[PDB]
Design a protein around this ligand. Structure first.
Ligand code: HEM
Ligand SMILES: [Cl-]
Ligand SMILES: [Cl-]
Ligand SMILES: [Cl-]
Ligand SMILES: [Cl-]
Ligand SMILES: [Cl-]
Ligand SMILES: [Cl-]
Length: 389
């Protein structure tokens, strides 16, 4: 009724189990709001590094559950920012912790336990990387139903870790919610800021064995033993030239991607779940040879080792000086091998016709730590236990 009255939400009690073999926020169903924040660790020794991960585990445990946060002593600063009121609600919140290559340098003595393919992001030919938006010691992926819940969670982290963490860069994004599909039917993949369904050909996140071979680091693999059940995280802040894209004919938009815009169907199919048959189209008349999906996934037995699980968000910043809207895709994908995953796929995508409307400006390579298995475990414990003494 009244203007400033808060909107009503029925999803404030949405929750996800923080514990598990894997961290949440990868195979977890993606909510409407996301945020990636990169940090630099200011720990002076191993004692401070241990306190950082223990404090991170304690705060994420509470933020992903909720509880009373009213400061009963007004002489002290409030324990909570108060954005969600005196009682914190979960609101589908998940926080995923990933570490970068710079965390495994001379500073912290973790160099021995570095994952094999964890490296520093090198600029691709179409890139225009901004130094203040790249790399970092650590990333925290915030995902919730609303951006305010993510901001409240980021407020909590920096309030409880003001000296051990330095905020490097951040990017918030959303995905457009849709009306519920027919009862018992799967929803469509959310659309990006280019108007296309994004995530249709993603590998089945419900297929556990497929996620074990392509997304999750398996025990017994060549990676260090502590890194089992982890995953490589690739972040790319890609700017969309939306004015020139909206001037492009629809047939050109679909030829560039290889998918019908409205239905999300391939050039030789009818449904979004359909996949193209490149064996029947060797010369690329139905699906162009330089199409986005054809270059990213040629659908050969060798290309199967390059599958990636994408989890992007649509981000929108301000406006530049010549009048163009600064908006694009917060690209996030996960893979058991970063070199085999995003790095090989992006190498195939170098020179694609989609680059006419793309401009990557930030991001980095990080390794998502394995999940917290029990109450006596905490995030990064297996990494700290692998580098003891
Ligand atoms: C920058 C690195 C990117 C990588 C590594 C990547 C990777 C992929 C992969 C693996 C697929 C699956 C294709 C298939 O299996 O047939 C795909 C499809 C697709 N991508 Fe990307 N992509 C990137 C950037 C983008 C950007 C910037 C957009 C902007 C709109 C985009 C939009 C799409 C669309 C619409 C599809 C088809 C729907 C789908 O199958 O998800 N991609 N991409
Ligand atoms: Cl699990
Ligand atoms: Cl601190
Ligand atoms: Cl932002
Ligand atoms: Cl549909
Ligand atoms: Cl500018
Ligand atoms: Cl312990």
């Amino acid at each position: 009724a009244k203007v400033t009255e808060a909107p009503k939400s029925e999803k404030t009690q949405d929750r996800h189990d923080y514990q598990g073999q894997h961290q949440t926020g990868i195979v977890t169903p993606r909510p409407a709001a996301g945020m990636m924040v990169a940090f630099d660790v200011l720990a002076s020794d191993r004692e401070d590094l241990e306190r950082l991960f223990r404090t991170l585990d304690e705060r994420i445990r509470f933020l992903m559950t909720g509880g009373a946060v009213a400061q009963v002593d007004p002489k002290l600063p409030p324990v909570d920012s108060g954005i969600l009121g005196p009682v914190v609600v979960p609101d589908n919140l998940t926080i995923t912790v990933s570490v970068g290559e710079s965390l495994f340098d001379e500073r912290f003595g973790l160099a021995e336990a570095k994952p094999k393919r964890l490296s520093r992001m090198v600029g691709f030919p179409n890139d225009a990387l901004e130094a203040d938006q790249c790399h970092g010691d650590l990333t925290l992926q915030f995902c919730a139903n609303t951006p305010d819940s993510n901001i409240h969670a980021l407020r909590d982290i920096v309030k409880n870790l003001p000296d051990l963490l330095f905020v490097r860069w951040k990017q918030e994004g959303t995905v457009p919610p849709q009306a519920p599909a027919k009862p018992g039917e799967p929803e469509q993949s959310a659309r990006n800021f280019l108007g296309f369904r994004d995530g249709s050909a993603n590998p089945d996140s419900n297929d556990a064995r497929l996620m074990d071979t392509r997304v999750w680091v398996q025990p017994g693999s060549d990676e260090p033993a502590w890194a089992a059940h982890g995953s490589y995280q690739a972040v790319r802040i890609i700017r969309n030239f939306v004015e020139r894209w909206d001037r492009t004919p629809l047939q050109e938009q679909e030829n560039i991607f290889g998918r019908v815009k409205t239905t999300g169907a391939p050039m030789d199919g009818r449904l979004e779940s359909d996949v193209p048959d490149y064996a029947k189209d060797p010369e690329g008349k139905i699906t162009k040879l330089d199409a986005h999906i054809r270059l990213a996934n040629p659908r050969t037995p060798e290309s199967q080792q390059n599958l990636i699980l994408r989890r992007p968000f649509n981000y929108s910043n301000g406006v530049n000086k010549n009048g163009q809207l600064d908006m694009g895709l917060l690209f996030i994908c996960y893979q058991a091998d970063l070199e085999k995953g995003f790095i090989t796929v992006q190498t195939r995508l170098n020179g694609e016709p989609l680059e006419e409307y793309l401009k990557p400006v930030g991001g980095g390579y990080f390794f998502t730590l394995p999940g917290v298995t029990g109450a006596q475990d905490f995030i990064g414990r297996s990494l700290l236990d692998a580098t003891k003494t």
